[PDB]
Symmetry: D2
Subunit: 387 residues, 4 copies
Amino acid sequence: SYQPTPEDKFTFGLWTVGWQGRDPFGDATRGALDPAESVRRLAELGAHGVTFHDDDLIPFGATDSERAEHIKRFRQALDETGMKVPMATTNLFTHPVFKDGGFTANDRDVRRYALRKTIRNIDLAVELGAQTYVAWGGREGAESGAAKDVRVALDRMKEAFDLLGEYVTSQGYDTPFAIEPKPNEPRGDILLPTIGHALAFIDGLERPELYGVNPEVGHEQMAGLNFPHGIAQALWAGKLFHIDLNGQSGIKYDQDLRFGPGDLRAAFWLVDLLESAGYEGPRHFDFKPPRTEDFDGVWASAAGCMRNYLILKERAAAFRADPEVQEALRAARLDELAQPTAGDGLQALLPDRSAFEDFDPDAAAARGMAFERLDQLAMDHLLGARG
Amino acid sequence: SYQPTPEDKFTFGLWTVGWQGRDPFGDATRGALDPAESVRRLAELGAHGVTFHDDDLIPFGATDSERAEHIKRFRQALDETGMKVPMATTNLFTHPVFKDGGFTANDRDVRRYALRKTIRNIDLAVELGAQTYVAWGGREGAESGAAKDVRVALDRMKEAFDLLGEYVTSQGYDTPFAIEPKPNEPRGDILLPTIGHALAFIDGLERPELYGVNPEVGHEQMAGLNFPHGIAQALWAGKLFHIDLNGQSGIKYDQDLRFGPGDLRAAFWLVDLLESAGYEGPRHFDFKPPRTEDFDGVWASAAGCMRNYLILKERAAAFRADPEVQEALRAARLDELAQPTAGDGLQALLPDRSAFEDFDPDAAAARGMAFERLDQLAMDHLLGARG
Amino acid sequence: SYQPTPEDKFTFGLWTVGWQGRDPFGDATRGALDPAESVRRLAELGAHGVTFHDDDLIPFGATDSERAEHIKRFRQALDETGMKVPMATTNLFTHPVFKDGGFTANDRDVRRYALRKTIRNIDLAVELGAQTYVAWGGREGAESGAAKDVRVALDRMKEAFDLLGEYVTSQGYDTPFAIEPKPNEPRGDILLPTIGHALAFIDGLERPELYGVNPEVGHEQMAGLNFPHGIAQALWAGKLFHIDLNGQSGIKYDQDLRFGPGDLRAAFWLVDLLESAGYEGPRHFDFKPPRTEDFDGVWASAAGCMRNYLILKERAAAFRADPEVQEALRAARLDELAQPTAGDGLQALLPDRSAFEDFDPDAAAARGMAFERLDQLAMDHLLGARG
Amino acid sequence: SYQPTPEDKFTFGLWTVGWQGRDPFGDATRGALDPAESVRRLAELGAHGVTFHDDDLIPFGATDSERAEHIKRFRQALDETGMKVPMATTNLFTHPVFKDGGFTANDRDVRRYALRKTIRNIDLAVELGAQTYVAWGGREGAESGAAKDVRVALDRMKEAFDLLGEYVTSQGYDTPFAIEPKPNEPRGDILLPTIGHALAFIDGLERPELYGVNPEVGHEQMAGLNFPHGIAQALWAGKLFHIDLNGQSGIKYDQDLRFGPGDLRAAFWLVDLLESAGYEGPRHFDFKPPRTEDFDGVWASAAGCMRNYLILKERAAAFRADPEVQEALRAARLDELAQPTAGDGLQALLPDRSAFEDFDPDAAAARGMAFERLDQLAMDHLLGARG
Ligand SMILES: [Co+2]
Ligand SMILES: [Co+2]
Ligand SMILES: [Co+2]
Ligand SMILES: [Co+2]
Ligand SMILES: [Mg+2]
Ligand SMILES: [Mg+2]
Ligand SMILES: [Mg+2]
Ligand SMILES: [Mg+2]
């Protein structure tokens, strides 16, 4: 069977299995969950670690006394379980004060508070052993055109992240930042909507090396984009610092279904890529057990997240191992793709008559790509109607 | 009234007003147009210049004798009209040989031919005075997962553009490249699908300064993204080298409607941004007169493209000039957005008690953003129910 | 100027201007509003009437004593204002018990309770003078395939509505039902997702005459459909019993922006159609003032809803009145469209040689539709760069 | 293994395996295919029959002499193969004359020609044994608002179909019509965009019994809708007369991928429904082998269409047969869903205290739907990590 073990690197945020089910049109259908219990319940399931928003661990506005009380209880569950905290993030979207964003709110004082709120939780994150600190600017954006001048908003966003990089370097912390993009929801349009926009923005920072991305399956799909393709570009750039796994059934509200659900073929191609690419980071699940479920459903859902990954991992390995497939790849010229286009140089290429002058486009066009047989073999493997 | 003059910088590609109306489910509904005639007809309309794909000017496979004959006729119409050729591009998507792409085709020989085909047209482009050379990788992508290894495909894409940069520098040409992104169509998923992905890829090139982007209104909207926001990020990065204007009515096939049509409010915010940002490049129209039209409709459509821009330009200027609006902006704190978040520095910010310790989130949250009044004023101006 | 008066038929639901701003990722940013105050504030704005969910007027679980107390206060504000209550609806989506729907919940007892909850509020609705009772099955649907057998779910949906029709007829009430479709959110997929599905389902009811539809601008657009086209089919069928006006910026979560915002051209074509079609029902606004606003923004937003309609109404009238347009319509053959295709009959048509045998397709194909000039005139009128 | 046999009812249109690969941005990549050869090649593959557009079998404008010559050759291949022709349709979208549609073109003479063109092919269809005649109004719609008055267009559409019903009845033919909906492409918006709109329109015809729908997987998904849900409503109405199977990877241009590709989970739920519902019509494949393929790819793709259906059929049967699943269904109350809500009647329900008065919503709300375990079992079966 497919049993998960901490070696599998499966992590969950406290806000996932702890989602009470409140949605824009309804009230919670599940009671609150104590962080400590989530950690032990997740450990029992085979999880490798957990993640958290500051507000998930410590109630907003809690006093220094209560705060410390909340971390101790949390620390005790981790210690007794050996559960890791590989990632932490800040909540800059729930409280009304962040209604127009945190780092890019028009009000300067909210921006300052947002930075101070973030820095406090970074200290905590490092203390617990977190290697990656995630930022999701869910409230950074607008619903109308003049409410936000994006050029200047980007200036403020850069200022915030540059300030965070200075802090982290001045303290000598060994932690990196990962920007998690999202096209929209809760704002009409969110700034840095996709993996590409985030990657591009990162290269305009004072210390680009400290920042990367934490893409989420469902978010890129909310833009109708190809997640695995997006992930490939992030890997090609050396910026996949983390990743959120879940399911989305197309362009609509952020569903946050359990991994495997939604676009199944995309999930297969994602796993194929992550494993074949050698990604060594956590396989984090940012999902939400549907509000139709009780606590038995919450864990059954959480378990489903890892099982599907393990099953998909097996099918992908089988797929690539298959000699029939390797032959199918050669037939489609996947090997010629890896060959430099002009390893001989520009000049040589310019004097190469068989590259233009003596080239027969019609003859080359007649070559079938043989992509379909290859895809059907991929399908056979996924359905297990073969390895 | 709103009359266009060459000073307005309105340009058109030969393939726009020259589209015969062939679509995936139908045959042409208009006869071929001679480039020379388009140039004169466009000049009469007030256009500033024209653009072209190599295959638009010279028939594919044409001999050196016929080729020269085609350019001469074209050159004669330009000379007599004083029409400029500010941009040129290559056609690497129509011929069957490019069925799997040009720069990223699995077949190495097609990739070489693609580069040679491009370099030839660059020479021509410079000869005609083109300052920007556009690249739209319409065939670079895939319909199935294993048909293309995106990491290596990106390597090939980088190789191609780096080779193009070497060539352009070795010849001392004063011309820049602009990548035109598109999410999908004709391929299931196209590489560098949005402005963000293109911007990010550019910073991985050997000579980033030579490359920028040529975004198209309808393309970003095919991903459901906010075009003006995307344009702002391109401007913030100093990469808006060119721009294609048109209309799209949502997420579906590439419509290429005339500018103004489709998302009208977005067109207003785009114009507002371009003018207020001081963009000084061509206002290029990559549209397609619907195939329901005759030649009278083709020019009426082309004329509509510029009129709408002129009308939108007027409304935007009026909008920003309006003192009632300037007051509305201050009320929404658009001015505080331009104020550095921590001009006093990190240390000072860390010791600022009124930024966290003595901050009252509830009191600040109570402040209305007053975004709606601002938006309704924007609406009033657009409909001319005011300036 | 454009001032609204009760004669304009502008109505608002209590849940609109009364939305506290709680969203899936945040807490309310506005305090509760007393129904009585909304009625007086809306009356002052020029509204014609208001609508309500049972739970909007009476707190869920309220005792018969408190209930009566809540209706009296509400009744007093109406009486003193002369405000009408043309429509009422039930809330079968907020309480956890409706997590799997009301009429189509798998649990039979929840279905019964849902019917009883609805019937109670129908009595109240009639008592206040409501002519239309709206049903929005926001929770009727699923997130996974086997969780719901749609054929049987439809059987249960039909049973519920048939039961409602029997009740309404047995009591002799003069009230009709309007089904409000929505593609998704809060459920992964909602049953009767569009105007078409609702219309089709209605004809399978025992008493079709009693049911029609209450389409919402943003909902059909969440499916990427053409609202005005959808509205036309509902009118053609004689089923547009009501209508919800608002704005949506494309395929994403239900934004519920103020009318005019979102797809502006669609709003123009909608108004053109409603007025030219002679729709005589309320112009109901089911929108949500953005949570970035305070109470000043809430009313400014509400006011914007009516102003935009009045401005659009003017532009449409001007557009159709314009003789230049009437000439443009004839040029596009909008008049031939109204001519029966075969008023002479089938037999005659079969013996008509000029309909096939002697028909010249090429000659007819050469005729331009002249749709662009017509559209640009429509644009000129909308921007007021003309009547 | 999964071998197809004529008993499987797999049919293909000549235009599918015969697509030359011409797309909006490219030229054909495959040569023409002779109908006769397709029939024999498909028969060899295990197909049950074929379908055709009039223009697919007989070249447009062909003389009565050539026409007869084309049908004879076609008839010979069928006879020798024993291949059936269960469905036929008309091509009213390719020729320029249909640029504004057929049945709803503004020009009355084009509408007449469209009807005459259709009637001719109906005669042929019946002669070959076709039981269903499909209509896809690909050109019926618009790109701009005033170019088409949808109310009157619907009148013309109704007139056309009513005329077709009169003809078919006057001749005593035993053939039914199936409307194939599509949201957009090639027109900006197509009339009767979804299954629902088509179903609703059908009930406004003079002889509703003669008409049903021929939904296509990819088309409903172009609107982001749930195909299986749509199919369920068509079945519930007794209108699923035919069905087109294929794949689509989300909201974008009509891909027409091979069945199984695109939304795989949806394909599983579709097959589950068709088989469990007892649909007895052809499993028609309206797909397009990608233009990257040669003829070897064309048949490999065609074969993939049936294999995937056979594999999915097996997995669905296994899924429902599984006792663990049957137990999971009961746990989710799928059985209570089949129980009448008020089998006891309205009056009894009104006097039932345990349906409202004595009902405990909170207690009922606490019941988990147990939908996730059920879905994960569905997943296990699909991946074959179980039956
Ligand atoms: Co999410
Ligand atoms: Co385009
Ligand atoms: Co809504
Ligand atoms: Co199709
Ligand atoms: Mg996430
Ligand atoms: Mg373009
Ligand atoms: Mg509504
Ligand atoms: Mg079809």
